Symmetry: C3
Subunit: 129 residues, 3 copies
């Protein structure tokens, strides 16, 4: 899958690396993909450049808030439910990020919708499962 993170400026590069490693671990745990199925980008924003409310749910947001968009081949409802919990558990334990600071949106594509290198469609050719 591809994980795209949107955060506010303010973290060191070490704290960004911790957040990416903790999130990658949770993704691998929840989806059962290979450990080297790692594709992640980080976009840093100034305070004027993200607005993230809570739909009245009573969360909890600070400048450490992490918005994660995920593009993935289909996953079961349970895999998704598990990933959210695994992700906030790892971000709390390993990065000190409050679960109230984590927002996730997933979008689905299919086998033909990926090319990992060399102009190849590796799910189609069977190079990948």
């Amino acid at each position: 899958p591809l994980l795209k993170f949107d955060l506010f400026y303010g973290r060191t590069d070490a704290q960004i690396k911790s957040l990416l490693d903790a999130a990658h671990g949770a993704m691998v745990d929840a989806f059962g993909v290979p450990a080297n199925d790692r594709y992640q980008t980080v976009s840093q924003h100034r305070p004027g450049e993200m607005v993230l409310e809570d739909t009245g749910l009573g969360y909890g947001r600070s400048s450490a808030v992490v918005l994660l968009t995920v593009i993935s081949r289909p996953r079961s409802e349970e895999q998704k439910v598990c990933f959210y919990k695994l992700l906030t558990g790892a971000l709390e334990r390993d990065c000190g990020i409050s679960p109230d600071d984590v927002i996730v949106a997933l979008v689905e594509n299919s086998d033909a919708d990926w090319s990992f290198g060399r102009g190849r469609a590796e799910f189609l050719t069977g190079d990948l499962v």
Copy 2:
């Protein structure tokens, strides 16, 4: 929904907030979601960093151009048609942005595909409707 804006550098932060407010109002009006269902990011680009033409339609593009990507649960074709008109109307009235300077693309997902906080799937648990 999640609303991601791509614009060129040049606006003050007040003018950015005005754009974000106007778009959010249009979205709430078109789609009927709660007023605090607000999730917006902005990425600012140098001239070398966005190219946005017109598919030969005859628009209109200036440095003020706004590309908006939306991720949303399913909406009717009517609601989308309505949103595009509400959005340009609001951006023109509230921000002075020409309707020729507004480009939108929407992507759909489903109930299971959202977690708003605490590792919860609120559309699934019924915390949100739904």
Copy 3:
């Protein structure tokens, strides 16, 4: 379609433009859309801000690596397969980018999901095929 590029800092704006032009050519060739169906953004990243592995496929990633995300109406499987090959073909020939440095993810939407200008839905009104 909308082509969103994520790259590391390092290229001149001429090098960026040559990347965008090559990719646009490939997409026009593979999908048969009008030449002025051109909608592209670029986000530049510091070394800390993208991690792109290979899922054990044996690629080849340098600081020149390009991650492209495409939003498009539906395309046949063959068209997507052709696009990936045409893309790396052009990026190598015109930009000097190794095919091991090209990663593509596509996401699909429908006619009702686009508004190119003036609050119009051009695929719905028939202004556009």
